[PDB]
């Protein structure tokens, strides 16, 4: 009556709120499949064994699953057991004989678990390590753009019909890269000291790019650059300010290693120590123009001139100023 | 469903999303026609509004509320007042975004809340981060120039947007010390 | 085909008059049947905006003197107007000579505040009003603290200002 009547008419409210379906059906087997299945059961004489499901149409399930894939939680579809999404079987569409439907929703739930755990990790930093913090932001950066596409698609439902086969085949070039993400995160959750807990992940990042060396390798590279930002800054600090800032010794070398800057590292340490002993008597903004003018192999060998020039300048200036007014020779 | 969400987040509390000092803003959550889908999204959205209420309330409370009757360093003082002055200017594009969103809703009358929650995801990280800075200042009774380090130690984070956001508040707090130093020196 | 039939969260300009109808009925049940809410809906937006613009000149609205949460918004902009009148009333005098000069100096900002309203808005929205006269309105409220509405006057005021 007057708002409940409008609810019943012009809003759905018939599985997500318990009020059995009055969706108009124009029967005849392509969508009378439940009833013909019941008659076939009766001819096989079950006897009676009655199942209870709530009877939805298909498209509502599609929008709910797209919501599940976007990253929100707590939906009516997909019972949640201990943290893991699992397909519910108390939900029926007339055709697909209730067994196909279970499989398709189980596959979408199999993807939804992978999305949920990552968003769980992202939520757990919102309620000094600084490398985890730089990692989740890049993960988040993937996720917001990823959510944008699905949110676009869901709008076009309101304005045309869209089926399951459309939505699974549409998300192929994203679920491809999601499988990579499932493998990268496995070693980022495998762990005492904060320096090994970061280097173990970062070295896996350095190694994994060569495995795919189109569109995946750019994703890995763009993920790579936003995660080595802390170490780059700290190294540049040790260069130009002479001192290494300690965060319970976040750097690998004590005042566990990475391959990333090892083959020039001796020139770097010999740079840091020399600068503070000189005073006793922009690197990112250079790295980015290099991208304007193989990936993390030969391109990485162009990074070392930036630090090497600075090193040469520092050590030569110290050697020069030691030979006059104390005149070692 | 759409437009008093702007009303509630704007800082005029709603009769649906109930403002409490112990539950923030909160949906009534007893309708015989609510669904589990909308619940999580409203919960995600109400956090930013709770933080916004706390921020704007504190800024109005401790900036220019006296004619000078010593004071308290964490509840008065010119560094603290300048901190609030930086803080509301940082909060400005959120207000601009809400003003844009109403025009979007007016242009297309059939719109859902997930569209909104998708757009506001960039404040979703920025607003909880900055709360702990002012929380530490308020609780720990930090007096004088030690305020200047506190946002400075918290501009060492691995999030570039939050770091750049806090840097402006620190830049505002430099100028008052500059102004007095120009006279004493 | 007939369609997929709009969700609740979709369309918040009509499902919302329905949502509020439901919740108002729930409230009246939970009260007992008598609580009597004052104008829980009416009228429009721009008409209310124009009345609010008239408040900043000094004529208070038809609910004030010297959607239901509109009352929460309205009270924020109304009280501003009620302090505005409490400054021009404090500047009504033509005593102390320096106080007269200071009072005529206060009129130079009250004239500004009168000049901005009813010229600059191209019929702005309601939320723009609350946002816009917040960064200006608290500054106006500070002057109510500066004035009385004992009180230092004459040189005793002028030293107090120094």
Curated annotation (Swiss-Prot), chain A:
Taxonomy, superkingdom: Eukaryota
A molecular-function term among this protein's GO annotations: gamma-tubulin binding
Annotated tissue distribution: Widely expressed, with highest levels in heart and skeletal muscle and moderate levels in brain.
KW Methyltransferase (keyword) present: no
Signal peptide: none
One record GO biological process: spindle assembly
Principal location class: cytoplasm
Alphabetized UniProt keyword annotations: Cytoplasm, Cytoskeleton, Microtubule
Gene Ontology cellular-component terms listed: centrosome; ciliary basal body; cilium; cytosol; gamma-tubulin complex; gamma-tubulin ring complex; microtubule; spindle pole
Cellular location(s): Cytoplasm, Cytoskeleton, Microtubule organizing center, Centrosome
Subunit structure: Component of the gamma-tubulin ring complex (gTuRC) consisting of TUBGCP2, TUBGCP3, TUBGCP4, TUBGCP5 and TUBGCP6 and gamma-tubulin TUBG1 or TUBG2. TUBGCP2, TUBGCP3, TUBGCP4, TUBGCP5 and TUBGCP6 assemble in a 5:5:2:1:1 stoichiometry; each is associated with a gamma-tubulin, thereby arranging 14 gamma-tubulins in a helical manner. Gamma-tubulin at the first position is blocked by TUBGCP3 at the last position, allowing 13 protafilaments to grow into a microtubule.
Biological role: Component of the gamma-tubulin ring complex (gTuRC) which mediates microtubule nucleation. The gTuRC regulates the minus-end nucleation of alpha-beta tubulin heterodimers that grow into microtubule protafilaments, a critical step in centrosome duplication and spindle formation.
Protein family membership: Belongs to the TUBGCP family.
Name of the protein this chain belongs to: Gamma-tubulin complex component 5
Organism in which the protein naturally occurs: Homo sapiens
Swiss-Prot record, chain B:
Subcellular location: Cytoplasm, Cytoskeleton, Microtubule organizing center, Centrosome
Organ and tissue specificity: Ubiquitously expressed.
Known partners and oligomeric status: Component of the gamma-tubulin ring complex (gTuRC) consisting of TUBGCP2, TUBGCP3, TUBGCP4, TUBGCP5 and TUBGCP6 and gamma-tubulin TUBG1 or TUBG2. TUBGCP2, TUBGCP3, TUBGCP4, TUBGCP5 and TUBGCP6 assemble in a 5:5:2:1:1 stoichiometry; each is associated with a gamma-tubulin, thereby arranging 14 gamma-tubulins in a helical manner. Gamma-tubulin at the first position is blocked by TUBGCP3 at the last position, allowing 13 protafilaments to grow into a microtubule.
Function: Component of the gamma-tubulin ring complex (gTuRC) which mediates microtubule nucleation. The gTuRC regulates the minus-end nucleation of alpha-beta tubulin heterodimers that grow into microtubule protafilaments, a critical step in centrosome duplication and spindle formation.
Family indicated by similarity: Belongs to the TUBGCP family.
Disease with which this protein is associated in UniProt: Microcephaly and chorioretinopathy, autosomal recessive, 3: A disorder characterized by congenital microcephaly and chorioretinal dysplasia associated with poor vision and nystagmus. Variable ocular anomalies include microphthalmia, retinal folding, retinal detachment, optic nerve hypoplasia, absence of retinal vessels, round areas of chorioretinal atrophy, and attenuated electroretinogram. Most patients have mild developmental delay and mild learning difficulties.
Name by which UniProt lists this protein: Gamma-tubulin complex component 4
Organism encoding this protein: Homo sapiens (Human)
Residues of the full protein shown: 1 to 191 of 667
From Swiss-Prot, chain C:
Cystine bridges: none
Domain of life per record: Eukaryota
Location(s) in or outside the cell: Cytoplasm, Cytoskeleton, Microtubule organizing center, Centrosome
Transmembrane segments: none
UniProt function note: Component of the gamma-tubulin ring complex (gTuRC) which mediates microtubule nucleation. The gTuRC regulates the minus-end nucleation of alpha-beta tubulin heterodimers that grow into microtubule protafilaments, a critical step in centrosome duplication and spindle formation.
Annotated disease: Microcephaly and chorioretinopathy, autosomal recessive, 1: A syndrome characterized by microcephaly, cognitive impairment, underdeveloped retina and choroid, and epilepsy in some patients. The more anterior parts of the retina, near the periphery and pars plana, have a grayish hue and diminutive vasculature similar to retinopathy of prematurity. Visual impairment becomes evident during the first year of life.
Family of this protein: Belongs to the TUBGCP family.
Record's subunit section: Component of the gamma-tubulin ring complex (gTuRC) consisting of TUBGCP2, TUBGCP3, TUBGCP4, TUBGCP5 and TUBGCP6 and gamma-tubulin TUBG1 or TUBG2. TUBGCP2, TUBGCP3, TUBGCP4, TUBGCP5 and TUBGCP6 assemble in a 5:5:2:1:1 stoichiometry; each is associated with a gamma-tubulin, thereby arranging 14 gamma-tubulins in a helical manner. Gamma-tubulin at the first position is blocked by TUBGCP3 at the last position, allowing 13 protafilaments to grow into a microtubule.
Name of this protein: Gamma-tubulin complex component 6
Biological source species: Homo sapiens
Gene: TUBGCP6
First and last residues shown, out of full length: 305 to 506 of 1819
């Amino acid at each position: 009556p007057d708002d409940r009547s409008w609810l019943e008419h012009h809003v759905v409210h018939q599985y997500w709120t318990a009020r059995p379906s009055q969706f108009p059906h124009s029967l005849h087997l392509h969508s009378n499949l439940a009833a013909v299945w019941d008659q076939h059961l009766y001819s096989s004489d079950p006897l009676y064994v009655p199942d209870d499901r709530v009877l939805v149409t298909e498209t509502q399930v599609i929008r709910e699953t797209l919501w599940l894939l976007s990253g929100v939680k707590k939906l009516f579809i997909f019972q949640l057991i201990d943290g893991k999404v699992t397909v519910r079987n108390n939900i029926i569409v007339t055709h697909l004989t209730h067994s196909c439907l279970r499989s398709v929703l189980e596959q979408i739930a199999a993807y939804g678990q992978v999305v949920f755990r990552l968003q769980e990790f992202i939520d757990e930093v919102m309620g000094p390590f600084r490398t985890y913090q730089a990692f989740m932001w890049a993960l988040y950066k993937y996720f917001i753009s990823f959510k944008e596409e699905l949110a676009e698609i869901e709008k076009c439902i309101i304005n045309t019909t869209i089926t399951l086969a459309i939505v699974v085949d549409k998300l192929a070039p994203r679920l491809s890269q999601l499988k990579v993400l499932h493998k990268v995160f496995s070693t980022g959750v495998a762990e005492t000291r904060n320096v090994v807990r970061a280097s173990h992940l970062l070295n896996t990042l350095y190694k994994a790019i060569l495995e795919y060396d189109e569109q995946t390798v750019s994703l890995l590279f763009s993920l790579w650059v936003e995660t080595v930002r802390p170490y780059l800054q700290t190294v540049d600090e040790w260069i130009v300010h002479g001192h290494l800032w300690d965060g319970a010794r976040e750097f690998i070398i004590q005042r566990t290693m990475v391959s990333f800057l090892k083959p020039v590292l001796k020139q770097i340490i010999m740079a840091g120590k020399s600068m503070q002993l000189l005073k006793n008597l922009e690197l990112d903004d250079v790295h980015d123009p290099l991208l304007a003018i193989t990936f993390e192999l030969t391109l990485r060998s162009c990074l070392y001139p930036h630090i090497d020039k600075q090193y040469l300048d520092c050590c030569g200036n110290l050697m020069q100023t030691l030979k006059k007014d104390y005149r070692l020779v | 469903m759409i437009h008093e969400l702007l009303l509630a987040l704007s800082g005029y509390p709603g009769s649906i999303f109930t403002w409490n000092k112990r539950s923030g803003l909160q949906v009534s959550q007893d309708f015989p026609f609510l669904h589990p889908s909308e619940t999580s999204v409203l919960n995600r959205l109400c956090r930013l509004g709770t933080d916004y209420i706390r921020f704007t309330e504190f800024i109005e409370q401790y900036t220019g509320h006296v004619q000078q009757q010593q004071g308290q360093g964490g509840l008065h003082g010119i560094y603290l007042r300048a901190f609030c002055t930086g803080l509301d200017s940082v909060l400005q594009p959120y207000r601009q975004a809400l003003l844009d969103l109403e025009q979007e809703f007016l242009g297309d009358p059939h719109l859902s809340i997930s569209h909104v929650n998708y757009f506001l995801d960039q404040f979703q990280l920025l607003f909880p981060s900055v709360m702990v800075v002012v929380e530490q200042i308020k609780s720990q009774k930090i007096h004088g120039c030690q305020i200047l380090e506190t946002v400075y130690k918290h501009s060492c984070g691995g999030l570039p947007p939050v770091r750049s956001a806090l840097e402006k508040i620190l830049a505002v707090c430099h100028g008052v010390m500059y102004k007095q130093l120009s006279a004493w020196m | 085909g007939h369609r997929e039939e709009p969700y609740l969260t979709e369309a918040g300009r009509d499902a919302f008059d329905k949502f509020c109808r439901l919740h108002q009925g729930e409230l009246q049940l939970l009260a007992g049947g008598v609580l009597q809410a004052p104008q829980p809906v009416l009228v429009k937006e721009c008409e209310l905006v124009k009345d609010v613009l008239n408040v900043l000149i000094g004529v208070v609205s038809a609910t004030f003197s010297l959607p239901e949460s509109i009352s929460s918004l309205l009270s924020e902009v109304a009280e501003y107007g009620t302090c505005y009148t409490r400054l021009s009333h404090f500047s009504l005098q033509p005593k102390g000579l320096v106080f007269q000069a200071f009072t005529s100096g206060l009129r130079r900002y009250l004239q500004y505040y009168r000049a901005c309203v009813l010229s600059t808005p191209p019929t702005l929205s309601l939320l723009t009003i609350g946002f816009l006269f917040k960064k200006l309105g608290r500054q106006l409220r500070y002057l109510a603290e500066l004035c009385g509405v004992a009180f230092p006057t004459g040189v005793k005021l002028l030293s107090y200002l120094y």
